[PDB]
Design a protein around this ligand. Structure first.
Ligand SMILES: O=C(O)C(=O)C[C@@H](O)[C@@H](O)[C@H](O)[C@H](O)COP(=O)(O)O
Ligand SMILES: O=C(O)C(=O)C[C@@H](O)[C@@H](O)[C@H](O)[C@H](O)COP(=O)(O)O
Ligand SMILES: O=C(O)C(=O)C[C@@H](O)[C@@H](O)[C@H](O)[C@H](O)COP(=O)(O)O
Ligand SMILES: O=C(O)C(=O)C[C@@H](O)[C@@H](O)[C@H](O)[C@H](O)COP(=O)(O)O
Ligand SMILES: [Cu+2]
Ligand SMILES: [Cu+2]
Ligand SMILES: [Cu+2]
Ligand SMILES: [Cu+2]
Lengths: 256, 258, 256, 258
């Protein structure tokens, strides 16, 4: 099934997760041919500023995510930042996410693989698409069976990311490929929200295995990535659009 | 809102090549009635990397060859100019005058094209940010152009590589009609890709939304005298045009206003 | 001799050329081991805006440059924009300059070469350093004997140029290399003036055959490239600095 | 304003390698009394591209080996850490704790280093703009660091290539002491250059102005187990250090304030 990974960027509160989770559950009942996976980070471990929001800790976050899985029967994903975190996170996370800056950290990758969960690696803004073959090879060496690579943009001069859509067919040679619709048009340190939907249309027309998109009931109040979180109320329309474009374009997806 | 398809062989290798490709584009134009086809070929490759590479058979020969395509098949014509004096003779045959990407800031060339009364299509320089095309359009409007296109053809991304930033399409749409160049956007300059990425990125362009696509084609690309690595085999053009019409239709209700 | 190419960006008036030319003459008498070449453009043929200053025409410009050469006995350089301009310009210009955007225009290069003058090609912001070998080959084919390549920065995302100093030793394989201190830190469409002197120190420490630097008595009033023209009064100090650093560093310039 | 030279073999291939290089750096430190030498070697290459590549002999072995260099030669020591728990044991031997470039935004790693009371040297990420190092320094100051360096090691420039934007040196100097990494700045990541550009770009860095240079060195680079293409032969270190002291001296009166 096509994957849709969605949720609020950060675990701002169990309350926020339950509100978002309720809508993701409703959509999962409406779009049965899509596999939904609920995402939220227990820690923003790489904020630019020491004064910015990080979160409420790994214990609180894992608990809140457990509530979402229990209340709604949704699969769960969250990111890890150091190797020791893999095991406790794997108790709740069906997919362990590796942050883009950390895509080359061998121990983090091996720790995630050791848990027996699926692993989704964000492609570093410094990595070339062909450079991801070695990422997959580490994860296979560590025992991983279900592996995703996520396109999230590439450094393009200062304070800008570009999406090179050539990466989608290149990375598909060795893993399932997800397109991150949210952070790919985030300007680090043109934009931004106005480009989210057009580029997710591009990703599906080119061909991918799923889309990653963050959502919040009121984006302007979000504590992380406010400029690019999608309003919750817009998610349904975008998902239906994704599915329609994929239905038509998929006739033309090239083999391997 | 007829979608534009600009297509033809990169260079005017011979009048015979032009008529062979023209016959196919004419056949497609009769099938895809919802498309406006414009036939393209360059009478001069004025910017080749090497002094030893094919340039062409001269302006007079090329205009005559293009005129024969227009006469025989009733197709609109486009070709590129390189210095201001070429605008006048070229406008005798060309419905759309093309401005090469490296020359997109050359004021005199832009004005020369604009005062002919023909449509003008400027290739966006590999050095230019999408928001900086606003002034290119202003120059053309100042010079009398009433029908203006901007063509996305990739941006310098380190050495010998171009990337297509698809954010450029909605940005440039604020000021002109936008064409996606499927051929030169995946060329690696000075020596992906390349051919394997042409069709995926065309699909991206139409899903994002554009007003036309530019695609070069040759019966036998391996033998072409210019851009051999990226010209589409002529037999593949029909299938690609059908795909972009299908993808455009399904994506179109989602295209953002303005 | 080390080359210093300097002058006001645009021929704003014969008056401006004579004021600048007077100082360049004085410096040429003070620094006898340097070859000075006076630069000014008769046309800014590639301005972003239709409303910006271009100049007073080729005839006026060639005349003003002739006045500088006659009054001060200085060598002259100016840029051309279309092939027909090479011959009339060559009447006064010792070095014909090819603009960066036009570095691949075969006819312009051949027209410049045909005049028998030296030719200095600005390296396009799109060109790789190894890509310049073919530029030199065109000029040799057209009869040119004295050929320069000028480093002027490379496209680095949007509205930014970076100087890759690896280009200096690479381009030296096939031509004399000039470093453009002015336009290399011009942001098209960090910066800017504060970086001019530090990067010209880098260029001389790496090793080049000359430096190109634009100057105006009152930069803030200049009609082109105001943000990067050096105040005339600062030129002497920078030249002396160049020469001192070159004297020491040249011990280490690698062969070929 | 003693200039810093950080030098040593990329990886702790063996304690024996360390002592061989250490003996030479000690000899140079006695000649170039105006330089503060800091000996560098990594106990772990934690970010290699391939699972098959050399990583090292473990933290305990590496710290012991570094301690032997400090004991035998009286040299200051630096090494890099990869996860927060390493800061404490490493601070037992390291005068300067190095933060790898990909990890320059990892708040916990920065704080772990800062609270040790050791100096901290952060490699600027290949993704980071020079003005965005201000917040990296703020994090370290918040965490108690009193001696902070920022190291220029190149910026992503298309695929598999780094460029050094020397404007970064005066920009970063606003907030920290600045080191130029002569070795990794010309490495082509994931497979110029390379070695032929090391010395020219060091000359550029000192002419622009910096507070130190970082240079890896191995008696026989061809045989090194990491960064073999860019490690300097040990016999060349003396000549390069003399050149940068000469160029620094002649350039120094021109270094801009602040
Ligand atoms: O959680 C994810 O999926 C991510 O991609 C991580 C992403 O949210 C982070 O890298 C943030 O974008 C980043 O910390 C925000 O940066 P800043 O607003 O602190 O400058
Ligand atoms: O004619 C067009 O539409 C163009 O975009 C011009 C384009 O064909 C040219 O820039 C060629 O790609 C270029 O001269 C070929 O370069 P090279 O093979 O000589 O290195
Ligand atoms: O004359 C030279 O040496 C040059 O390098 C040409 C240079 O002055 C021009 O490219 C200008 O920098 C350019 O027209 C100014 O751009 P803008 O201020 O019109 O956006
Ligand atoms: O130790 C340092 O100072 C560094 O800058 C770390 C540096 O050695 C590493 O990033 C290596 O360059 C990198 O693991 C080598 O990459 P690869 O040869 O495995 O592709
Ligand atoms: Cu986020
Ligand atoms: Cu072509
Ligand atoms: Cu100028
Ligand atoms: Cu190293």
């Amino acid at each position: 099934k096509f994957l849709v990974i969605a949720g609020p960027c950060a675990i701002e509160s169990e309350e926020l997760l339950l509100k978002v989770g309720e809508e993701i559950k409703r959509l999962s009942e409406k779009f049965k041919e899509v596999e939904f996976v609920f995402k939220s980070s227990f820690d923003k471990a790489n904020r630019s500023s020491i004064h910015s929001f990080r979160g409420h800790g790994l214990e609180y976050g894992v608990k809140a995510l457990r509530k979402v899985k229990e209340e709604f029967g949704l699969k769960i994903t969250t990111d890890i930042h150091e190797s020791w975190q893999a095991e406790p996170v794997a108790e709740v996370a069906d997919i362990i996410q590796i942050p883009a800056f950390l895509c080359r950290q061998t121990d983090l990758l091996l720790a995630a693989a050791k848990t027996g969960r699926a692993v989704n690696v964000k492609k570093g803004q410094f990595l070339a698409p062909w450079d991801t073959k070695n990422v997959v090879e580490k994860l296979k060496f560590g025992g991983a069976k279900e592996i995703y690579l996520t396109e999230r943009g590439t450094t393009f001069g200062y304070n800008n990311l570009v999406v090179d859509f050539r990466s989608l067919p290149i990375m598909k040679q060795w893993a399932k490929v997800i397109y991150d619709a949210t952070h790919s048009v985030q300007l680090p340190g043109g934009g931004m929200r106005e480009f989210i939907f057009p580029l997710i249309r591009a990703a599906v027309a080119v061909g991918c295995d799923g889309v990653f998109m963050e959502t919040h009931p009121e984006p302007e109040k979000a504590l992380s990535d406010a400029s690019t979180q999608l309003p919750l109320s817009q998610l349904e329309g975008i998902i239906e659009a994704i599915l329609e474009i994929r239905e038509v374009a998929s006739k033309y997806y090239e083999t391997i």
